[PDB]
From a paper:
In the heterocystous cyanobacterium Nostoc sp. PCC 7120, one such strategy is the use of an ArsR-SmtB transcriptional regulator RexT that senses H2O2 and upregulates expression of thioredoxin to maintain cellular redox homeostasis. Different from many other members of the ArsR-SmtB family which bind metal ions, RexT has been proposed to use disulfide bond formation as a trigger to bind and release DNA. Here, we present high-resolution crystal structures of RexT in the reduced and H2O2-treated states. These structures reveal that RexT showcases the ArsR-SmtB winged-helix-turn-helix fold and forms a vicinal disulfide bond to orchestrate a response to H2O2. Each protomer of RexT has an α1-α2-α3-α4-β1-β2-α5a/b architecture.
Second, this SeMet structure was used as a model for the molecular replacement to determine a higher resolution structure of native RexT to 1.95-Å resolution. The asymmetric unit of the RexT crystal structure contains a homodimer of RexT, which is consistent with the oligomeric state observed in solution using size-exclusion chromatography. The dimer interface of RexT is formed by a coiled-coil interaction between the α1 helices (residues 13–22) and between the α5b helices (residues 91–96) of each protomer. The buried interface area is 707.6 Å2, ~11.5-percent of the total surface area of each protomer. The location of the Cys105 residue, which is only modeled in chain B of the determined structure is located ~20 Å away from both Cys40 and Cys41. Similarly, in both monomeric units of the reduced RexT structure, the mainchain amide of the corresponding Cys41 interacts with a molecule, which is best modeled as a chloride anion from the crystallization buffer. In the dimeric structure of RexT, the wHTH region shows an overall positive electrostatic potential and appears well-poised to interact with DNA.
Author numbering:
A (entry chain B): 1 to 105
B (entry chain A): -1 to 102
The structure:
């Protein structure tokens, strides 16, 4: 599988994770990946410029939140739930409890 | 005994992404961690950057995002965690963040 860049768990920090979630578009991506499982980039039809969405997914990958792979021409994103729960127990649940939907609303 | 606070948003204007962005920095997370365990703290206690303009910007972000109040008292600026606002809006968030925050 063509996995895109992603850090090893050891190089994932709490400030980086909080930073990655610190954006309405990125929070909404994480919220949908958590509830619906893996989703290609094109499912996140935000009213947002192409280069900006690309930077968003780079931020999510560099921070250790999302694992992306190329399948065909799709970029398939996966929430790194197991890594995040191992490092930061209960963090995802506390964030997702309060995250307000955007794309489904 | 001053209740003279710098600009802070109303509870209704605090958003979860804005709060997470404010915590999403080693200096700012440590400020929040210290306010949470030690109580109110003067700005001069937080020597977490080479430049004073960098610390000023950290506190500006903490105040504008709804995490921190800043009180002007004499010559000092005293910071206070907005525990009630944050816990009412984002139940369990502060605990989850603080449980994993590592001392800087
Ligand atoms: Cl795609
Ligand atoms: Cl306001
Ligand atoms: Cl001060």
């Amino acid at each position: 599988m063509r996995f895109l860049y992603h850090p090893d768990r050891k190089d994932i920090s709490l400030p980086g994770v909080l930073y990655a979630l610190g954006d309405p578009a990125r929070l909404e991506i994480v919220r949908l990946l958590a509830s619906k499982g893996e989703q290609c980039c094109a499912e996140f039809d935000f009213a947002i410029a192409k280069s900006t969405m690309s930077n968003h997914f780079k931020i999510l990958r560099e921070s250790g939140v999302v694992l992306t792979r190329k399948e065909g021409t799709q970029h398939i994103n996966r929430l790194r739930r197991e890594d995040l729960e191992t490092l930061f127990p209960g963090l995802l649940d506390a964030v997702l409890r309060s995250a307000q939907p955007l794309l489904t609303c």
